[PDB]
Amino acid sequence: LYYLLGERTRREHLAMDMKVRASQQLKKDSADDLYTLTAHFNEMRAAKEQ
Amino acid sequence: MREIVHIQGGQCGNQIGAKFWEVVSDEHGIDPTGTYHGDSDLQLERINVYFYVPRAILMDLEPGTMDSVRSGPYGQIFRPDNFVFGQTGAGNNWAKGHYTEGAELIDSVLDVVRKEAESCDCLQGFQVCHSLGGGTGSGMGTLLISKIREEYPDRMMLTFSVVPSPKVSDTVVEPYNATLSVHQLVENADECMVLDNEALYDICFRTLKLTTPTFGDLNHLISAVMSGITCCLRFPGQLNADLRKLAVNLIPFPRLHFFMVGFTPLTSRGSQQYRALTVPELTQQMWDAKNMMCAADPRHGRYLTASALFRGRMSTKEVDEQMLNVQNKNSSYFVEWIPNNVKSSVCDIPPKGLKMSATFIGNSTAIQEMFKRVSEQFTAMFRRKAFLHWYTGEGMDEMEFTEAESNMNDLVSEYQQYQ
Amino acid sequence: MREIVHIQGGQCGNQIGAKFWEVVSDEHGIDPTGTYHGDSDLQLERINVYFNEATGGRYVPRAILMDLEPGTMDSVRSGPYGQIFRPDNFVFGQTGAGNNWAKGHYTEGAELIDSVLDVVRKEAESCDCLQGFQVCHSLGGGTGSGMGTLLISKIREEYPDRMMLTFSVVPSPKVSDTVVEPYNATLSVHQLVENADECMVLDNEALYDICFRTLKLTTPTFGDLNHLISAVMSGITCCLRFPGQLNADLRKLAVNLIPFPRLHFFMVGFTPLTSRGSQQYRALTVPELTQQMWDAKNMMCAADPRHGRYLTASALFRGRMSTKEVDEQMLNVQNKNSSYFVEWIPNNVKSSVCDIPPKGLKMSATFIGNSTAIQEMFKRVSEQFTAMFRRKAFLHWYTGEGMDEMEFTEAESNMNDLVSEYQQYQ
Amino acid sequence: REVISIHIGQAGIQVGNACWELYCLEHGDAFNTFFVPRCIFLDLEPTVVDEVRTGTYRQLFHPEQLISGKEDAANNFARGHYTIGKEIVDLALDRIRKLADNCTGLQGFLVFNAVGGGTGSGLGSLLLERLSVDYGKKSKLGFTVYPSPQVSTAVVEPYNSVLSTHSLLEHTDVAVMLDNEAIYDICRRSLDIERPTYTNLNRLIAQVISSLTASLRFDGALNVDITEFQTNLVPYPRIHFMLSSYAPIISAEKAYHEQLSVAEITNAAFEPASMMVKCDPRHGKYMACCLMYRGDVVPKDVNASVATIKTKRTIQFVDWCPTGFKCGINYQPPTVVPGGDLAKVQRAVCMISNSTAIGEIFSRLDHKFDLMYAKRAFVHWYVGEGMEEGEFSEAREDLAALEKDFEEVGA
Numbered sequence A: 001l002y003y004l005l006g007e008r009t010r011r012e013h014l015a016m017d018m019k020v021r022a023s024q025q026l027k028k029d030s031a032d033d034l035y036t037l038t039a040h041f042n043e044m045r046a047a048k049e050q
Numbered sequence B: 001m002r003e004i005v006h007i008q009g010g011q012c013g014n015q016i017g018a019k020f021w022e023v024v025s026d027e028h029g030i031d032p033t034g035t036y037h038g039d040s041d042l043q044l045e046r047i048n049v050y051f052y053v054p055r056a057i058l059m060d061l062e063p064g065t066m067d068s069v070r071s072g073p074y075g076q077i078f079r080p081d082n083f084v085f086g087q088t089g090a091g092n093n094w095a096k097g098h099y100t101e102g103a104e105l106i107d108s109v110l111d112v113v114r115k116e117a118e119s120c121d122c123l124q125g126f127q128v129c130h131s132l133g134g135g136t137g138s139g140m141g142t143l144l145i146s147k148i149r150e151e152y153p154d155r156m157m158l159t160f161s162v163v164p165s166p167k168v169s170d171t172v173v174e175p176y177n178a179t180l181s182v183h184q185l186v187e188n189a190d191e192c193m194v195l196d197n198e199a200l201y202d203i204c205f206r207t208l209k210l211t212t213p214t215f216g217d218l219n220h221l222i223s224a225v226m227s228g229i230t231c232c233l234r235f236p237g238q239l240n241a242d243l244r245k246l247a248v249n250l251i252p253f254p255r256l257h258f259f260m261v262g263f264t265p266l267t268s269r270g271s272q273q274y275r276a277l278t279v280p281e282l283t284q285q286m287w288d289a290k291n292m293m294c295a296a297d298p299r300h301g302r303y304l305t306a307s308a309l310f311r312g313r314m315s316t317k318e319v320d321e322q323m324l325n326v327q328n329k330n331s332s333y334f335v336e337w338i339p340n341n342v343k344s345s346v347c348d349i350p351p352k353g354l355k356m357s358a359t360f361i362g363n364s365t366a367i368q369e370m371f372k373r374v375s376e377q378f379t380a381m382f383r384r385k386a387f388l389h390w391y392t393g394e395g396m397d398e399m400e401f402t403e404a405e406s407n408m409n410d411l412v413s414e415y416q417q418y419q
Numbered sequence C: 001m002r003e004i005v006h007i008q009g010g011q012c013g014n015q016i017g018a019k020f021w022e023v024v025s026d027e028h029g030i031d032p033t034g035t036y037h038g039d040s041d042l043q044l045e046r047i048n049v050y051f052n053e054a055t056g057g058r059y060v061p062r063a064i065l066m067d068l069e070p071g072t073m074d075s076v077r078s079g080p081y082g083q084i085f086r087p088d089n090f091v092f093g094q095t096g097a098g099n100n101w102a103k104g105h106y107t108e109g110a111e112l113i114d115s116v117l118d119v120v121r122k123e124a125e126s127c128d129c130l131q132g133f134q135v136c137h138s139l140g141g142g143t144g145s146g147m148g149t150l151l152i153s154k155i156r157e158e159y160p161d162r163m164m165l166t167f168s169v170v171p172s173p174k175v176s177d178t179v180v181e182p183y184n185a186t187l188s189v190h191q192l193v194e195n196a197d198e199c200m201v202l203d204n205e206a207l208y209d210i211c212f213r214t215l216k217l218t219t220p221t222f223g224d225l226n227h228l229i230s231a232v233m234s235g236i237t238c239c240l241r242f243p244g245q246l247n248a249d250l251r252k253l254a255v256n257l258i259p260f261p262r263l264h265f266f267m268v269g270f271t272p273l274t275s276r277g278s279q280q281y282r283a284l285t286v287p288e289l290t291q292q293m294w295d296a297k298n299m300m301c302a303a304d305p306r307h308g309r310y311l312t313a314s315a316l317f318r319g320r321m322s323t324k325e326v327d328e329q330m331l332n333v334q335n336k337n338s339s340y341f342v343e344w345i346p347n348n349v350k351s352s353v354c355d356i357p358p359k360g361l362k363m364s365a366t367f368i369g370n371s372t373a374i375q376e377m378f379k380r381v382s383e384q385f386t387a388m389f390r391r392k393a394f395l396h397w398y399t400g401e402g403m404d405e406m407e408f409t410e411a412e413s414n415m416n417d418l419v420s421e422y423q424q425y426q
Numbered sequence D: 001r002e003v004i005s006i007h008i009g010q011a012g013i014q015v016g017n018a019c020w021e022l023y024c025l026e027h028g029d030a031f032n033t034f035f036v037p038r039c040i041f042l043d044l045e046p047t048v049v050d051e052v053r054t055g056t057y058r059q060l061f062h063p064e065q066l067i068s069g070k071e072d073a074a075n076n077f078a079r080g081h082y083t084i085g086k087e088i089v090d091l092a093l094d095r096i097r098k099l100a101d102n103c104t105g106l107q108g109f110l111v112f113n114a115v116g117g118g119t120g121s122g123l124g125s126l127l128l129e130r131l132s133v134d135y136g137k138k139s140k141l142g143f144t145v146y147p148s149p150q151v152s153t154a155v156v157e158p159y160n161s162v163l164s165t166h167s168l169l170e171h172t173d174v175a176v177m178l179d180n181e182a183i184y185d186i187c188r189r190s191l192d193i194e195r196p197t198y199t200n201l202n203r204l205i206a207q208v209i210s211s212l213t214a215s216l217r218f219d220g221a222l223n224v225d226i227t228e229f230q231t232n233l234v235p236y237p238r239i240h241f242m243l244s245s246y247a248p249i250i251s252a253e254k255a256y257h258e259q260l261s262v263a264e265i266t267n268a269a270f271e272p273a274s275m276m277v278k279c280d281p282r283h284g285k286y287m288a289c290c291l292m293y294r295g296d297v298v299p300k301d302v303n304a305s306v307a308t309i310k311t312k313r314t315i316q317f318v319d320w321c322p323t324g325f326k327c328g329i330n331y332q333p334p335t336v337v338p339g340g341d342l343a344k345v346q347r348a349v350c351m352i353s354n355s356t357a358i359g360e361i362f363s364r365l366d367h368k369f370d371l372m373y374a375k376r377a378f379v380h381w382y383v384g385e386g387m388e389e390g391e392f393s394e395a396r397e398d399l400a401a402l403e404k405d406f407e408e409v410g411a
């Protein structure tokens, strides 16, 4: 019984790890979106100053 | 006539200053033995500004830096009486380096600098190279700045200070030192040229394309900046601009004296003969945002003022259309209620090895990003009093850190206000 | 004054430009170290169109090598005249696309185009008065076709007022290297019709034919094929570099050869090209140059223009020539073979002369003929494209990357209406 | 710039037999910090001390420095603290005084002891108490050997470990944990010695000690003295117990094949399979790390490696410390000992960090101590030696307070 409890717990921990990895991808690309989008805001800002 | 006294504090300050005197002594043609061997007679005329024994004062708290100074070349040229030097060592404790160990070394460093100050006739100012992360460099150097202003209030004062960055973080108590050091700098130094290792490592990666940038080359880059900024005193020009004239042209408000610096030209060994040396080309390297030596991208904000010190036989007409073009093209990146935000200067003597060089000093409003970048780390650590007892059990109390916080907070507020 | 920047994409593009910069630098008398050693001053006054003086007689070519594989760039720098390019202009990825137009247009393009654009922007603002851009690439590969075509699109959004040449080889059924050639050719052409100014179609099939019959080479490696292509390309832009009795610049030639805005795929030839066996047995007169020019077997594309009709044609002559002899010889070859020429435009040929022949020759020529036989190529490729897409072969390597089925229907529709409208003007 | 080193007990002076062999071999002005040596061996049994007196280093050590008692402590903290310590400790500190008197710029003392025994626990704590009174401000580097959970040579070692740590809190300023079972596993896994003895253990302990004092003996690109560990690694006055690790602990065969560089050895110094304490730092959250670099290392890649560590997620950091590192670079490569089982390396790394995995060790020890104490087993031996029933329970509650401190700070 314990030999199989261990397999279910290992499965649960891996299901969390692949989730943690995917969360880092979301963190990274969203940071990239801020850089490109704030550039867009500066361009519109430049447009109105002119 | 016009005189500049040098003061080097801490391990970081000493190795930067060691490389500085190497470059200047080379420019003035003085050998590592201490005798003149130069060619031109323009160099002898303005060698009293720095000298032939240098007019420097090294100061620290560990013998290793002094031993490493006399070991290398141009280490036999310092006067052994100027090696004012403690013995115990603060060691990355601002309280120790500002209250405990400073309290007995400061009297002796002040005596030697006072003798070295009154030895000449008319001071232009002092020039201090130090850090903001270490203890014996930052704290002791900081107290020296405060003591000097009480004795010499009408003289200029330069501070080449490096700041800690979270990407390049040496010690754990970095924000505890940087915040307190700024709290004293904002009211004491005349102006500061902010440096940091992150931007320096970044410069040596992209532009210099060096494989292993040891501390020798970083100190070499900072040294080229310091040689370029005082060339106007040491050599005639078609338009002269000493230290005082740069300060009054760059600082619109009395608390806005933290500058970002760049240098041009900087090219890899491979692309060294594949390039041209023209004023427009140097300007595109000057105003590049990846060429500033701080971790604060100036294109995330506005410029207040900017200056460019040129060296070499140039046509002043070219200077003016380049400066006006950069102002009329990117008009949003510059402040609106000051027209013609650019100060310029020309000197006829280039650095040894180049035909035409330039030095950029930009007073931008992107500086509030790095100071907020620092206050974040400081805020979290201070809230639960981490590492606080190593400072508190020395004389420092809690309101001192709160006071430094308020000064950090209202500085970035007025940068935002003037933005 | 008038300025041309150079852009080489992919492996094929890199070698073409390498032989090109060797030949041009030779014409200007610059040694592989990059210093001036010429004799007269006819060469010095017009080296600003292509090169930039660096320091003390150092002239650097204004070229940008762009690709995705390290070996391709390394090979150009190992060989001679490799040490002359500025290392900043070696814009270069690390992963690789590998004959995938989707990877070259959506996956790896999105992270390299910005950097090469920065180099292109710096190289464009380094000069005063732009004349146009010059792009060399292929239509079968992925890192040259898809990435290079997106580069074309970015430029048209940036500089829509300047000229643009693209020297592109096309895949043929008889000379078919890769397996995904149709899925690349159709989408590339689709983007070319909406972005390029004019395209000069080349192909490897015609290149093999020339090297067997006329050149009679024993081992024609790619160095010699690129030698032909470089001599032809230099012939187009000779007029900006040298003075002549009748100057014809690029924009002047474009407006003369393009009767309708979508009809900008040109066929090329070059004269004289002889074996070293028969070089001694002929002369150098205008008739010998014109007959070898207008020969269908001497065209540099595998599309026989004698299977259609010439709409317009142009000839750029080089050497000390008499314009009277020029137009009379051009007029004669236009009057005899009158059926191959379009009817409602008299004197379908624009002509120009330059007074400086290439080194080693007294007289050369270059032919640029906007024919209507190019519709055969698009049919000959489109049928292969349609044959695969009907039952979705190889589809998933693009579909799983971001394109849908509607993109292929769009690409086939534009080729279909293009072939229909070429057939209409036929 | 001088540091003196005292060695207590059978384990302390055997470790010293390796330390001083390495020091004299390494120095063949830089030697001034150690050199006659600046040491005092002291023990209550004369058998191990006279091994030094009849050994090869008969002439190196001044005769008086070798202190030896007349009878053993019988593996009793009480006996080695109140009965026999009272006669030897006064002679020991009367020597340390004039050794420090000969010195001028004394950085601090560093002590070597094992807390499972009688001498190392009892008079080791007693000696540290009187040194704190006499000097106080000078740093005392305590390299202790706590007993392992499953590998044990004694029976009553829980009693001694708890009773020693109670004083080890407020006396030493820097305390480094080293178990024996963990090092056994290290020598089996990486050094592939299937049958190790104490000699191999003591050899690589000396390598660690020499690596953290090399900043004083030799100039580096970024020097870090003994006061820096005091400040950069101890966030609170009651949390000073540091995990240690060293890399690369590699055999001759493997080392030449492997490409040793800063990034991979900085990684290797953070896995739990290469630490000197059997504990799971994944179970805890790091507070602050300190990285000692020796040899051919530029500041770039040490900074690059530390960036990769902070972005990985199998190891997490505390929220109160975003910049949790203190690096240090020195030029001199690590030396080797002929007969030693380590090969020459271009560059080595010693990590000294602080986490909450140590908080797990003290609970694991408390349970074993608690079980025996309730039915007063083995208590009567210590009580006869001079102690009472009170101090066992009060030392127990002191460890309980420490457990609560780790759970609260980690929150």
Ligand SMILES: Nc1nc2c(ncn2[C@@H]2O[C@H](COP(=O)(O)OP(=O)(O)OP(=O)(O)O)[C@@H](O)[C@H]2O)c(=O)[nH]1
Residues within 6 Å of the ligand: C245, C246, C252
């Ligand atoms: N008699 C004579 N006519 C010439 C000569 N050169 C050019 N032409 C004539 O010029 C006419 C075309 O005009 P060009 O002067 O060549 O060109 P343009 O007037 O400057 O106009 P663009 O080509 O747009 O610059 C042709 O029909 C030629 O007959 C020449 O040397 N002698």
Ligand SMILES: Nc1nc2c(ncn2[C@@H]2O[C@H](COP(=O)(O)OP(=O)(O)OP(=O)(O)O)[C@@H](O)[C@H]2O)c(=O)[nH]1
Residues within 6 Å of the ligand: D008, D009, D010, D011, D012, D014, D015, D044, D045, D072, D073, D074, D075, D076, D080, D114, D116, D117, D118, D119, D120, D145, D146, D147, D153, D180, D198, D199, D201, D202
């Ligand atoms: N690393 C290491 N540990 C040792 C060595 N010798 C003994 N120990 C450890 O010491 C502990 C046992 O206490 P001891 O050091 O023998 O006690 P002591 O210092 O001799 O004090 P007394 O025996 O009462 O005189 C156990 O943890 C042993 O593993 C050694 O040579 N190297």
Ligand SMILES: Nc1nc2c(ncn2[C@@H]2O[C@H](COP(=O)(O)OP(=O)(O)O)[C@@H](O)[C@H]2O)c(=O)[nH]1
Residues within 6 Å of the ligand: B009, B010, B011, B012, B013, B015, B016, B091, B092, B131, B133, B134, B135, B136, B137, B138, B162, B164, B169, B170, B171, B197, B215, B216, B218, B219
């Ligand atoms: N540019 C440069 N920075 C240095 C050098 N040496 C140390 N530093 C920086 O200084 C910081 C440590 O300061 P430290 O020397 O300990 O100051 P001190 O202890 O008060 O003397 C680190 O963050 C380093 O990045 C150097 O030679 N050049």
Ligand SMILES: Nc1nc2c(ncn2[C@@H]2O[C@H](COP(=O)(O)OP(=O)(O)O)[C@@H](O)[C@H]2O)c(=O)[nH]1
Residues within 6 Å of the ligand: C009, C010, C011, C012, C013, C015, C016, C099, C138, C140, C141, C142, C143, C144, C145, C169, C177, C178, C204, C207, C222, C223, C225, C226
């Ligand atoms: N004329 C010529 N054609 C070439 C050369 N190198 C490759 N090619 C052609 O390019 C085609 C394949 O394109 P490829 O090099 O893979 O393009 P890329 O990978 O996207 O850069 C083949 O059909 C070759 O005939 C060359 O040096 N000269």
